């Protein structure tokens, strides 16, 4: 359903985002090129995304229960992301992420459980 995917480097910087994700967030391709992994992450969620970044690179998978990504209009879009390392050859190559939109009341309910 309203789930979208995005490709990232191992440092979490954006490589690609599907059209559904760009419609939800409101950004064009030129606005997301060479965009850092924490660029649009809410200040209150920097440490949380950072720890899931460490779990991802050490284990190969990670799950972010609820965090905030700033939309182009200024509003905050709560997300629920599942990250995984994709292997080219037999080395970690890039990161694939599967997100899901969350309502404001839903993301704030998960804030105390993440």
TrEMBL record:
Coiled coil region boundaries: none
Localization, UniProt: Nucleus
All residue ranges annotated as the PAS domain in the record: 24-60
Protein name: Ahr homolog spineless
Source organism of this protein record: Drosophila melanogaster (Fruit fly)
